Design a protein around this nucleic acid. Structure first.
Lengths: 429, 263, 647, 60, 49, 193, 13
RNA sequence: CGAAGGAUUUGGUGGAU
């Protein structure tokens, strides 16, 4: 007994009983009211696992610390619509985030270039530009890799001319007029090109001088890819493939400090894949086929630099590790760039694929189809397994016709035929 | 809603510091009111947000939801020093008088900081303060002897006594502005309210109730009760001329609006 | 401060303010006593039906509650009152300014602990006395002996011993002799909770860092140590149903259950109470049952029961998880709007900043329910700023309309179904809803837009019918006469609109000196009062379209006001913390009150015997009685100067 | 009319038959101050004699 | 060099693994009789791989 | 069946000690399947080994354990994924699995993916055992470790040169990294000194 | 048939 | 139409009857 009382033993409580004995009787009676339980009596090692389970009731490792997003659960939150401040009057044919600034560019058959300041809560419009008689099948930002001060917007539609809008210095906002230029000279190759509607912009390093400048790629009538200088517009070289050109994608392969080569990837409906070396007059350097490909519709690369994840200087140039190939049937073969055998054959979509785009880190593949409403899924990479929680039947997507990932922050924009750009934010980023 | 989450003129009124959201990240920028600067401080955390903005006489103190206070020198475009409280609760308000620096957390804990020494001097809790949405230091001499605090009502507290001294019936809604116009005369305003209560510190009686045409967002005072300029939620600026001279309720005398040529 | 016309009796909608609740047994019926600000409420554990309430409000808030058979001990400021059945019988006043903090009553002894680490001991004057009244002695614990007192606890089989638990450690004091008999060894962590185990000489102790310490005081040594990393213990309680179980409350709102025999966790209840409101302020197992009661600072009291094991054997192995059985709750924040549900005055609707809509019963049943927000198909909604109700067409279609803050559309609510309706009403002018009203027939709903437009819909079909565009600023009031002929509107621009609802034409327009803030329309008398920005109440008759009565005296903005059901009186509340009763026939103020908290809303009952008011603080509703309904009242004009002096 | 729970409507040879609440007849008083309704419980009379309401006419 | 480049190297390094679905272990019961359980664990690894 | 319902998997977590060999390998299978189904804290993973290695006596149990051990870290996908084992476990691991046993484990062509575990083991060797630095060189040749695993292994060896005395096996390890991915070695050196 | 778990009425003792 | 699904059945508790 740690402690003893002196008062209880001395005091005599009438029924006269001494305290300590009287205390013992009180202990007995309460022991009668409730039985004594067995737990009170009780007072590398193998019992480590048993102990640790007792310490905590939360057993899922926290995803905040993990730099890799969970495979199957996507933490995605909807934000305000981008077009809410100023709605469009036609479908959103293309989307593009500015490489560094927080701007989202929209275009369509409205013939209007609407640029919005994406903040997620207000989404106001910065400026607008109407191009009379020039539908916009695709628009995109461009930032010169060497002169960071050079911004530019290139736009094209079902026309034999292309429009370039300079945004350098204060032209974007302060200027009361827009400095625009029309590219309408192909220098004797007009037969190959019927329209500028399908075009992309990339960086070409002139190796012999080490100078780096932008190029504009176009789709020709008969497997022709015409390459033009971004600023001067001169015809540099042309690449030819066999069969009807369906789509092409661009990859960068760094060589050394300040040296990289620009590889053009083109695909035929057969899945026959051509790779031209644009630093060597566009000579073929590899040929292969899409395993089990037929009715190919789209091709894309990512995990490094690309049109959706442009670089800000030479040293950020990185090689894409992933390559996807869409199809009319709804299959999306995936290839690991690190005849090839696809890593996986994604088949959740059952309609023609129209948009394939990777995340800036190359961890997510978003495929969408314009054929049917809500045709959009997100695949976790390299697991190649579709996310389940999102999208749901209650998710408003409509006829998805444009998709874009922000360079940073994990923002997703999805436009539809109704002219609404809906914005979502990935909590992991 | 306006893209500018928060803003505050410098005491001279020549430089404006504002905070806006770029994509998912907040950026803080400064512009010269009298007459472009492309430099903005970028918060690397989407979760991090700016709760309080206060100029210093060329540094600006920024209250973070993280539970710490950042001192920002605009010229260097870098955070010179961060004052971190023990708790992680967001800072609700900030005020300064020279080296003195007082802030309040979501726990309603008062803190005292020294700019010169870079140290947390004292922290304390006062009963009868269930929330503290506003903190204002009374301009008494060169030292702090009392503090004006308001969440729904307004309370006066003595630093040395660590107790409330006087209480003023405030607005039903949370108090938004608690500027002290002159001695024994401080104006009060609440969110979503068109009424400003002018209270006498020494007595505690409502001297006047100033009325705006619409809900008041911001308040600016000229001289010593010479005039008060209030920004209305509708986007118009109302000016009150000599509000401290029927008499209980006064209306704005001059109204200023901005409209484009197109309309 | 005393009204000659009104008198308080009870607050509605509050079950617990956050103070730990005590439990006791009266024969075979077990009761729970809960603190509600300056009063308390006793509920029957079998059905949680209210039984008794305090006859009068304590001058100071109650800090600690203790229950013992017919007597419940409440401590507030420096004096402890003995209550039986809610009545005052004998009051204990301590001799020091230090307020009481904690209470312990065992045998014939009452122990009271003040903030200054002083314990006051009382004894019954007679052995057969019902309650202790005589003062025996005073015992004070110094800093050297221990830290601040955590609680006063008495273990079983201890003759005249008080097991005082302090922040530093546990201390034993023999109250008969007033001597320190035993001092426990110092503990590394801060102690926060202490609960006597049923077993002898062992007391469970909860720290601030998720440690439960089962200190055997007889042997003076630790027995067991349960670890809950990243948590602090708020309450403790053991199961007395013959099954060895332990309950841990935490500030995070999680209730954990351990089986001490098997040294394992049975089941965890997450977020039963809100963390911001202190989580689980108290949770107690009822003596001899699988019943555990829980409470929190969120104005909610919940109960959970452990069903019998589903396994014929190894029942201890297969323990059913605790199950929700019954509870109450109320607003977790002060209500924003109130209205009387029906003419009979049996139910009232209430809206709060907590985004929750509730229906409070007025009778002794004290039944309280949430309005279900589950949308119909053909998080909580933003808080309401305006609401109207009507009762002609209840049970056929929607009979309530509401306007939400920063929301462009109004939502409908069905009283009979107690669920959201299938209709939403848009302002159609890019403006926010600022006024909502309904016709007496219950077929039409009126919505006032911030841009000055009035849109008229149909309640049953939810289709726009009529739009009137006269006001250029926000419309702050809409009303229609019982005849459904002449409709009245007011706006912030200072004008009052008069329309012919049947013919859709202007009868006239009236401009007032100051902007209008609100409107109330008395259909029987055909009079409506207006709260003007100049701190005046203007009464206007629709028939003759002229100002009728103007009231002066309010020192600040008028928060709310209403007509008496008789149409003879108007009572208004203003930001100057006063309630003034105005006699319309003479146009003068007959009574004045000073409220500690500004009354945000004021509403008469349909009968007129009752008056309901809401204040800036408090999760309940202050309901008043109309004394003129029992006798005559003079209409002599109240003295302004004396009323100002009182304020 | 009535609030008695005993009355049926307020809330093989045997007729399940109990009293029902009903109004057999109603007329106005010629005094234009009351109207009486014949019912099962008896002749109810409703009047305006109290006139405790305030209904001003052409007031200023 | 920069930290985010190292983080992207970590992300590049992570490789896919065969995920487990509901119909991955159903066939085990078919061949559970008269089997050395070392081989059972080996088969579990094989299907998991 | 409960893979989709992550909440139900969590409640399955609370629900080797037997000397019988069959009982230990039975526990190995349960741990292996569940870990890939649901990721777990490294503390759970580290505590799991201490139980596996406590009564690891049967040879067949050792083989099945080692396959289980390699799997668990492959499921680990957080910072410290390839950090060194703590000292007590590493001493336990080598005792129940000598270096030659692991070298044989890496020798077989059908070795399961274990680079996460191997890299975490390599840093343990350098921290605690100076004699086995040569075994690191033999270890690296047998298994190709992925890029960032290589970078961290270059990272810790750099501290060894500054702290530990220069040794043949130490420089031969560097010489190996000079042979493979020479540019990456400069990056580690550039960032560290 | 799945395990019936009836929320049997519980009356206090 | 549509922010992290829709529809049908069903046990129990609570309030009325």
């Amino acid at each position: 007994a740690a402690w003893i009382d002196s008062d209880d033993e001395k005091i005599k409580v009438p029924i006269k009983i001494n305290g300590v004995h009287y205390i013992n009787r009180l202990r007995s009676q309460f022991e009668k009211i409730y039985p004594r339980p067995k737990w009170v009596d009780d007072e590398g090692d193998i019992n480590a696992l048993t102990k640790i389970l007792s310490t905590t009731y939360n057993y899922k490792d926290t995803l905040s610390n993990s730099k890799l997003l969970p495979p199957k659960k996507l933490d995605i939150v909807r934000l305000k619509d981008a077009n809410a401040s100023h709605p469009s009057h036609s479908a959103i044919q293309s989307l593009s985030f500015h490489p560094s600034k927080p701007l989202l560019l929209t275009g369509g058959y409205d013939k209007t270039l609407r640029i919005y300041h994406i903040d997620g809560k207000t989404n106001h419009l910065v400026t607008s530009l109407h191009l009379v008689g020039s539908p916009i099948q695709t628009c995109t930002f461009y930032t010169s890799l060497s002169n960071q001060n050079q911004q530019n917007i290139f736009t094209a539609g079902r026309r034999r001319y292309m429009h370039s809008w300079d945004l350098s210095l204060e032209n974007l906002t302060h200027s009361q007029t827009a400095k625009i230029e029309k590219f309408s000279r192909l220098y004797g190759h007009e037969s190959t090109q019927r329209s500028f509607e399908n075009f992309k912009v990339a960086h070409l390093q002139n190796s012999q001088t080490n100078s780096v400048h932008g190029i504009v790629l176009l789709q020709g009538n008969n497997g022709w890819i015409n390459i033009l200088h971004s600023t001067s517009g001169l015809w540099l070289m042309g690449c030819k493939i066999e069969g009807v050109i369906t789509d092409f994608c661009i990859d960068y392969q760094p060589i050394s400090r300040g040296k990289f080569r620009t590889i053009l990837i083109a695909v035929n409906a057969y899945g026959e894949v051509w790779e031209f070396d644009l630093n060597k007059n566009g000579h073929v350097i590899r040929r292969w086929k899409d395993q089990g490909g037929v009715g190919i519709t789209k091709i894309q690369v990512g995990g490094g630099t690309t049109t959706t994840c442009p670089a800000l200087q030479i040293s950020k140039i990185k090689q894409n590790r992933w390559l996807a190939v869409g199809s009319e049937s709804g299959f999306v073969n995936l290839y690991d760039r690190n005849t090839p055998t696809p890593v996986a054959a994604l088949d959740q979509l059952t309609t023609t694929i129209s948009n394939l785009q990777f995340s800036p880190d190359g961890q997510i593949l978003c495929m969408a189809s314009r054929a049917v409403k809500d045709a959009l899924r997100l695949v976790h990479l390299p697991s190649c397994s579709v996310f389940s929680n999102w999208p749901t039947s209650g998710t408003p997507l409509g006829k998805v016709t444009s998709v874009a990932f922000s360079p940073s922050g994990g923002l997703l924009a999805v436009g539809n035929e109704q002219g609404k750009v809906r914005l979502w934010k990935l909590n992991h980023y | 809603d306006s893209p500018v989450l928060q803003s505050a003129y410098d005491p001279s009124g020549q430089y404006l510091c504002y905070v806006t959201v770029a994509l998912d990240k907040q950026r803080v920028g400064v512009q010269p009111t009298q007459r472009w600067n492309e430099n903005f401080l970028y918060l690397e955390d989407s979760k991090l947000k700016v709760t309080c903005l206060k100029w210093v006489n060329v540094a600006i103190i920024l209250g973070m939801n993280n539970g710490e206070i950042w001192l920002y020198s605009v010229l260097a475009n870098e955070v010179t020093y961060k004052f971190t409280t023990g708790n992680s609760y967001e800072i609700k308000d900030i005020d300064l008088m020279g080296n003195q620096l007082w802030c309040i957390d979501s726990s309603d804990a008062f803190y005292q900081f020294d700019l010169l020494q870079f140290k947390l001097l004292q922290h304390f809790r006062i009963n009868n303060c269930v929330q503290l949405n506003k903190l204002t230091i009374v301009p008494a001499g060169d030292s702090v002897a009392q503090l004006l605090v308001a969440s729904h009502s307004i309370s006066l507290i003595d630093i040395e006594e660590k107790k409330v001294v006087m209480t003023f019936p405030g607005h039903v809604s949370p108090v938004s502005t608690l500027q002290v116009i002159t001695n024994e005369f401080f104006i009060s305003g609440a969110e979503g309210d068109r009424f400003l209560n002018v209270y006498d510190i020494h007595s505690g009686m409502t001297k006047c109730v100033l009325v705006a045409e619409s809900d008041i967002k911001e308040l600016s005072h000229s001289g010593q009760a010479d005039s008060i300029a209030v920004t209305t939620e509708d986007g118009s600026l109302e000016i009150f001329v000599d509000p401290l001279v029927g008499n209980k309720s006064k209306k704005s005398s001059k109204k200023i609006q901005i409209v484009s040529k197109d309309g | 401060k005393n009204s000659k016309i009104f008198s308080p009796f009870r607050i509605i909608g509050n079950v617990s303010n956050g103070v730990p609740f005590a439990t006791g047994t009266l024969g075979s019926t077990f009761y729970i006593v809960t603190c509600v600000g300056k009063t308390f409420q006793i509920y029957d554990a079998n059905t949680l039906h209210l039984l008794f309430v305090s006859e009068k409000e304590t001058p100071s808030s109650i800090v600690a509650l203790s229950a013992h058979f017919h007597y419940v001990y409440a401590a507030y400021e420096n004096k402890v009152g003995i209550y039986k059945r809610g009545i005052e019988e004998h009051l204990l006043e301590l001799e020091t300014d230090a307020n009481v903090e904690h209470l312990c009553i065992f045998g014939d002894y009452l122990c009271a602990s003040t903030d200054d680490n002083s314990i006051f001991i009382y004894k019954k004057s007679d052995p057969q006395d019902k309650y202790p009244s005589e003062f025996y002695t005073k015992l004070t614990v110094t800093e050297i002996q221990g830290g601040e007192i955590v609680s006063l606890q008495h273990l079983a089989t201890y003759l005249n011993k008080l097991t005082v638990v302090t922040k530093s450690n546990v201390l034993l004091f023999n109250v008969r002799t007033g001597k320190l008999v035993f001092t426990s060894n110092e503990f590394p962590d801060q102690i926060t909770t202490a609960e006597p185990a049923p077993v002898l000489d062992i007391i469970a102790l909860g720290t601030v860092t998720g440690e439960v310490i089962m200190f055997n005081m007889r042997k003076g040594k630790r027995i067991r140590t349960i670890k809950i990393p990243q948590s602090r213990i708020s309450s403790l309680s053991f199961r007395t149903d013959g099954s060895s179980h332990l309950s841990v409350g935490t500030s995070s709102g999680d209730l954990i259950f351990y089986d001490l025999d098997r040294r394992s966790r049975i089941h965890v209840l997450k977020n039963i109470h809100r963390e911001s409101y202190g989580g689980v302020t108290q949770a107690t197992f009822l003596n001899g049952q699988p019943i555990i009661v829980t409470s929190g600072g969120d104005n909610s009291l919940k109960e959970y029961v452990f069903d019998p094991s589903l396994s014929q054997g190894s029942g201890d192995v297969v323990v059913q998880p605790p199950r929700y059985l019954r509870s109450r709750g109320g607003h977790s924040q002060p209500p924003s709007y109130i209205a009387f549900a029906d003419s009979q005055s049996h139910f009232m609707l209430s809206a709060s900043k907590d985004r929750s809509l509730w229906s409070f019963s007025l009778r002794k049943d004290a039944q309280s329910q949430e309005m279900s927000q589950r949308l119909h198909k053909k998080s909580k909604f933003p808080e309401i700023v305006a609401l109207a109700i009507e009762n002609a067409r209840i049970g056929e279609w929607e009979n309530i309309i509401t306007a939400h803050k920063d929301e462009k559309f109004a939502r409908t609510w069905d009283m009979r179904n107690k669920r959201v309706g299938r209709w939403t009403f848009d302002t159609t002018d890019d403006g926010f809803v600022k006024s909502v009203a309904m016709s007496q027939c219950g077929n039409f709903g009126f919505i006032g837009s911030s841009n000055g437009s009035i849109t008229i819909y149909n309640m049953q079909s939810g289709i726009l019918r009529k739009k009137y565009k006269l006001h250029k600023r926000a419309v702050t009031g809409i009303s229609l006469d019982g005849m459904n002929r002449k409709m009245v509107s007011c706006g912030l621009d200072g004008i009052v609109g008069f329309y012919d609802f049947n013919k859709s034409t202007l009868l006239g327009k009236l401009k007032l000196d100051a902007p209008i803030t609100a409107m109330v329309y008395h259909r029987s008398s055909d009079l409506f009062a207006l709260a003007l920005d100049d701190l005046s109440i203007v009464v206007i008759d629709a028939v003759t379209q002229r100002v009728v009565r103007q009231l002066w005296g309010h020192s600040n903005r008028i928060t709310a006001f209403d007509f008496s059901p008789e149409g003879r009186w108007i009572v208004s509340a203003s930001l100057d913390s006063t309630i003034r009763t105005w006699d319309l026939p003479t146009g003068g103020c007959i009574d004045g009150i000073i409220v500690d908290n500004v009354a945000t809303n004021v509403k008469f009952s349909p009968n007129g015997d009752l008056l309901a008011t809401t204040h800036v603080t408090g999760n309940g509703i202050c309901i008043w009685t109309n004394r003129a309904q029992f006798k005559t009242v003079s209409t002599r004009t109240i003295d302004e100067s004396e009323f100002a002096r009182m304020a | 009319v009535s609030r008695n729970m005993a009355l049926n409507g307020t809330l093989l040879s045997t007729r399940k038959m109990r009293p029902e609440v009903r109004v057999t007849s109603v007329q106005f008083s010629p005094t234009a101050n009351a109207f009486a309704a014949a019912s099962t419980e008896g002749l109810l009379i409703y009047s305006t004699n109290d006139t405790i309401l305030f209904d001003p006419f052409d007031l200023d | 060099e920069d930290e985010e480049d190292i983080a992207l190297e970590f992300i590049n390094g992570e490789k896919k693994d065969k995920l487990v679905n509901m119909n991955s272990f159903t066939s085990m019961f078919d061949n559970i009789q008269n089997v050395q359980m070392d081989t059972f664990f080996d088969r579990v690894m094989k299907v998991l791989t | 069946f409960n893979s989709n319902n992550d909440e139900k998997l969590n409640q399955l977590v609370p629900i080797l000690a037997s000397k019988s060999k069959d009982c230990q390998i039975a526990a190995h299978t349960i741990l292996v399947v569940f870990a890939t189904a649901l990721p777990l804290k490294k503390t759970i993973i580290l505590a799991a080994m201490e139980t596996i290695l406590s009564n690891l006596d049967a040879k067949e149990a050792k083989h099945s354990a080692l396959l289980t051990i390699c799997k668990l870290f492959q499921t680990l996908k957080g910072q410290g994924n390839v950090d060194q084992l703590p000292s007590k476990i590493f001493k336990l691991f080598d005792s129940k699995f000598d270096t030659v046993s692991i070298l044989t484990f890496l020798d077989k062509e059908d070795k399961p993916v274990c680079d996460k575990f191997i890299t975490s083991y390599t840093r343990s060797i350098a921290r605690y055992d100076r004699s086995k630095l040569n075994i690191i060189l033999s270890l690296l040749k047998k298994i190709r470790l992925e890029r960032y695993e290589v970078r961290l292994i270059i990272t810790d060896l750099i501290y060894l040169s500054e702290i530990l005395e220069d040794k043949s096996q130490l420089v031969e390890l560097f010489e190996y990294f000079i042979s493979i991915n020479e540019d990456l070695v400069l990056k580690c050196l550039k960032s560290l000194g | 048939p799945k395990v019936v778990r009836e929320a049997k009425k519980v009356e206090m003792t």
